[PDB]
């Protein structure tokens, strides 16, 4: 598996246009772009409100936050049995691929992943807040 690329010339699903679409965050900060390959033409629910017909073949939608792309991914994955992937797009044109960043979906184990943010202890074995006072910032005792 290799990291895929964004084709900007991918046909969008048939949709009349909502008021729950993009805002100035897409022009100033970022917007996220989802892509999947469909098996047939079928109506799905848009996460921003309304119904839309997907096209047979590749599809392309752009959303405003990550949770909208996860909601559409979960809908297209549990109801239609499809394999989508959504990217991160900056106004410079910078494209950041993620989900599945491993290529395999995170709901099953894959070799090569490195465990991050894992405390190797219980939750009752955290220290008291007196032990982490007067650091450079606020610290919960679970940070150490």
């Amino acid at each position: 598996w290799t990291v895929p690329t964004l084709n900007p010339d991918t046909p969008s699903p048939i949709f009349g246009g909502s008021t729950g679409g993009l805002l100035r965050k897409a022009q100033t900060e970022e917007f996220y772009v989802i892509t999947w390959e469909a098996k047939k033409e079928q109506i799905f629910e848009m996460p921003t409100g309304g119904a839309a017909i997907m096209r047979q073949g590749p599809n392309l939608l752009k959303f405003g936050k990550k949770e909208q792309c996860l909601a559409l991914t979960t809908q297209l994955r549990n109801k239609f049995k499809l394999t989508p992937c959504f990217y991160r797009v900056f106004p410079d044109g910078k494209v950041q691929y993620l989900h599945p960043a491993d290529g395999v979906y995170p709901e099953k184990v894959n070799a090569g992943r490195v465990g991050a943010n894992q405390n190797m202890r219980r939750i009752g074995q955290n220290v008291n807040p007196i032990k982490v006072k007067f650091s450079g910032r606020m610290m919960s005792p679970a940070e150490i």
């Binding site: 009349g16 909502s18 008021t19 729950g20 109506i43 629910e45 409100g49 119904a51 936050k65 809908q75």
Partner: protein, 738 residues
């Protein structure tokens, strides 16, 4: 093909599932481990969608449930008639309606509560009732307690028949799904048979029983001396003695010479001057017209023969350029989703109840009703509250449809879809107009308070300072008063005295006079508009964002009723549509409390009172006082709570007790509304420890109420408290000064 479709013996009549609490739910049939279970058992008891996915079984359940409700209502009516016959002063009241207080409840002589049996007149002691049953019974021509007793037995028999019908149509012969889906046939039968034959048979009862008995009661003859109704049916010569038209029989009906029936089918308008109620001849003609209209309306939809319309064809025929597919798909929605139907029917049923309140105050339909000021206030207020509750329910079940039944792959570019697709525009415009209304309506009151407080009354919004006259309403009022002359030639008077005109008085009291509209009425009407628009905002936002929002894109998967989605993303408390119903409930309470306050103060100030000129109950203070908040605070609330606060030691003392109790319950709600279940769970932990120490810890684990149950308990005690407070205030006030 429309036909009777029934399955034989689906569910065995057995006491087995009575002995297994929560049998209906796979989760709840496991038994109780914590206390939460109990509440769940009662909350989801009648949520038939969570029981089965099969629409047929659900439909059967709701059918028998409806039968249960009807049997309960028949028990209630039976009780009212029986208490009206055995424990009342109805006959005495019939002999002297103007100086005897209607009473149909008596208390037993224990612990001193006997004082509540007050001197209502007629040699009777009891609680004065304000439901208005006595006027309804006099209007129907009832004269003796025996007839009321017979009506009570009849209603009890009908209750037994309704409970048998419920048991029968659930356990023995339960209709099939395609029986329930015959909506064209259902509309035909309900428009013809129910409304049509209902008003036809009632017009029959009126023309044959009500008119002669009430004509004699208005003539002055003693009720016992009036001929019994069956003698009015049997000997038509008496009917010709009162109205000579009856001599000719039904010969003018079939020969189309209907003009000869003008003795008892009139168009007088106004009120009966010796009685203060609408003319029963006008009401008889009204019900005959209504009957013929509805029987015509009930032959519209095609059933088992070619003639007749088809609902899906009429819906699919109305499509324009702006709306695309238009009303396509709505038939499928309204014949497969009970919640959509319930939302529509609740909205129109609530609105209808509010219309009933306004039309019954303005055009008093029962004799000796307009001068029973307590009955008028009670009826208006009651039906207004019922209305508001049913509207909030409409919004609730609309949202429940939106989450559970909405399915866009049969509903694709549709009216509903476009509404969901421009909901941001809808809610933002409603938002702005609510803020605009709030600022200018409430700001006039605050402005007036400030100017009055600063010693500058000439700078206020009032009838003598900066005037804001309701020109449009005054013009409509004037037009409707001038209507009998030109645009309604066959009308002898206007439809209501409030348009303008003279004054009808009965027994020294004002039945109705012309209602004037000034700056204060302008201000309260825009307050009403503001509060209604806000309530619509909350409920409509709840239904439009029930499925998704920019905050919660997958809200639909979380259900209709859920507490939140965690403290993240800044905080998502009360994002569910249920919570929007919860807030709409509070705002509905606000709106209708200001509405009933408007009605109460205005009636006591500018309409009601005695005739010597007319001396009103509060002297006419509305026009100058209802422009400041301090004016409502002092001249309405503070001034008119004298009667409730000094009701101790008399028969109205129960209204003082329920005043205090209602204040208490209202405050008691704030503990649930302002707090959260984490604190309460930890407190319960400490208490559970204490119980463990003494070996009295229960096997069913004590749990704090859920977040949504905390909110539900909160809003329920809040509503109960506030409404009961205004109840005690209103009733004590109007019974003492009435």
């Amino acid at each position: 093909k429309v036909k009777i479709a029934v399955d034989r013996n689906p569910v065995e009549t057995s006491f087995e599932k009575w002995a297994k609490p929560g049998h209906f739910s796979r989760t709840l049939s496991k038994g109780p481990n914590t206390t939460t279970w109990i509440w769940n058992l009662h909350a989801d008891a009648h949520d038939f969608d969570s029981h089965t996915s099969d629409l047929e079984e659900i439909s059967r359940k709701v059918f028998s449930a409806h039968f249960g409700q009807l049997g309960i209502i028949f028990i209630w009516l039976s009780g009212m008639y029986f208490h009206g016959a055995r424990f009342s002063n109805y006959e005495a009241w019939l002999s002297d309606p103007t100086h005897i207080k209607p009473s149909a409840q008596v208390v037993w002589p224990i612990v001193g509560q006997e004082i509540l049996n007050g001197d209502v007149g007629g040699g009777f002691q009891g609680i004065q009732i304000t439901s208005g049953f006595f006027q309804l019974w006099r209007a129907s021509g009832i004269t003796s307690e025996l007839q009321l007793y017979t009506t009570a037995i009849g209603g009890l028999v009908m209750a037994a028949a309704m409970f048998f019908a419920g048991w029968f149509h659930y356990h023995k012969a339960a209709p099939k799904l395609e029986w329930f889906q015959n909506v064209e046939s259902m509309l035909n039968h309900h428009l013809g048979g129910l409304l049509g034959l209902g008003s036809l048979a009632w017009a029959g009862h009126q023309i044959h029983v009500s008119l002669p008995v009430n004509k004699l009661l208005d003539a002055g003859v003693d009720p016992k001396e009036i001929p019994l109704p069956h003698d009015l049916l049997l000997n038509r010569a008496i009917m010709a003695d009162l109205y000579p038209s009856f001599a000719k029989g039904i010969a003018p009906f079939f020969t189309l010479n209907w003009s000869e029936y003008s003795d008892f089918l009139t168009f007088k308008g106004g009120l009966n001057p010796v009685t203060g109620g609408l003319w029963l001849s006008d009401t008889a003609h009204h019900h005959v017209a209504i009957a013929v209209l509805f029987l015509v309306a009930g032959h519209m939809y095609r059933t088992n023969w070619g003639i007749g319309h088809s609902m899906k064809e009429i819906l699919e025929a109305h499509r324009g350029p702006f709306t695309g597919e238009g009303h396509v798909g709505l038939y499928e929605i309204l014949t497969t989703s009970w919640h959509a139907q319930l939302a529509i029917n609740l909205a129109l049923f609530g609105s209808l109840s509010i219309i009933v309140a306004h039309h019954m105050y303005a055009m008093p339909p029962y004799p000796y009703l307009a001068t029973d000021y307590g009955t008028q206030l009670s009826l208006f207020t009651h039906h207004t509250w019922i209305g508001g509750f049913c509207i909030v329910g409409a919004g609730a079940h609309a949202a429940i449809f939106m989450v559970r039944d909405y399915d866009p792959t049969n509903n694709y570019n549709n009216l509903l879809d476009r509404v969901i697709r421009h909901r941001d525009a809808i809610i933002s415009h409603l938002n702005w107009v609510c803020i605009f209304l709030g600022f200018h309506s409430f700001g006039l009151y605050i402005h007036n308070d400030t100017m009055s407080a600063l010693g500058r009354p000439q700078d206020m919004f009032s009838d003598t300072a900066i005037q804001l006259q309701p020109v449009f309403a005054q013009w409509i009022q004037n037009t409707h008063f001038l209507a009998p002359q030109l645009t309604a030639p066959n009308a002898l008077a206007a439809t209501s005295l409030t348009w303008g005109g003279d004054l009808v008085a009965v027994g020294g009291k004002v039945a109705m006079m012309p209602i004037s509209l000034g700056t204060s009425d302008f201000m309260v009407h825009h307050i009403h508009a503001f509060t209604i628009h806000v309530t619509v905002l909350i409920l409509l936002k709840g239904v439009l964002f029930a499925r998704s929002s920019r905050l919660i894109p997958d809200k639909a998967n979380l259900g209709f009723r859920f507490p939140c989605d965690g403290p993240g993303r800044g905080g998502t408390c009360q994002v569910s549509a249920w919570d929007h119903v919860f807030l709409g409930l509070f705002w509905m309470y606000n709106s209708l409390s200001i509405v009933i306050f408007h009605f109460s103060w205005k009636m006591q100030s500018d309409v009601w009172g005695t005739v010597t000129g007319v001396s009103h109950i509060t002297g006419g203070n509305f026009a100058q006082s209802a422009n400041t908040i301090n004016g409502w605070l002092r001249d309405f609330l503070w001034a008119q709570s004298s009667q409730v606060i000094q009701s101790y030691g008399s028969a109205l003392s129960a209204y003082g007790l329920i005043f205090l109790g209602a204040h208490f319950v209202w405050a008691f709600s704030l503990m649930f509304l302002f707090s959260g279940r984490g604190y309460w769970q930890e407190l319960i932990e400490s208490i559970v420890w204490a119980h463990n120490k003494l070996k009295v810890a229960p096997a069913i684990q004590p749990r704090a109420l859920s977040i949504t149950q905390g909110r539900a308990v909160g809003v329920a005690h809040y509503l109960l408290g506030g409404i009961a407070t205004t109840w005690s205030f209103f009733l004590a006030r109007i019974i003492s000064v009435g």
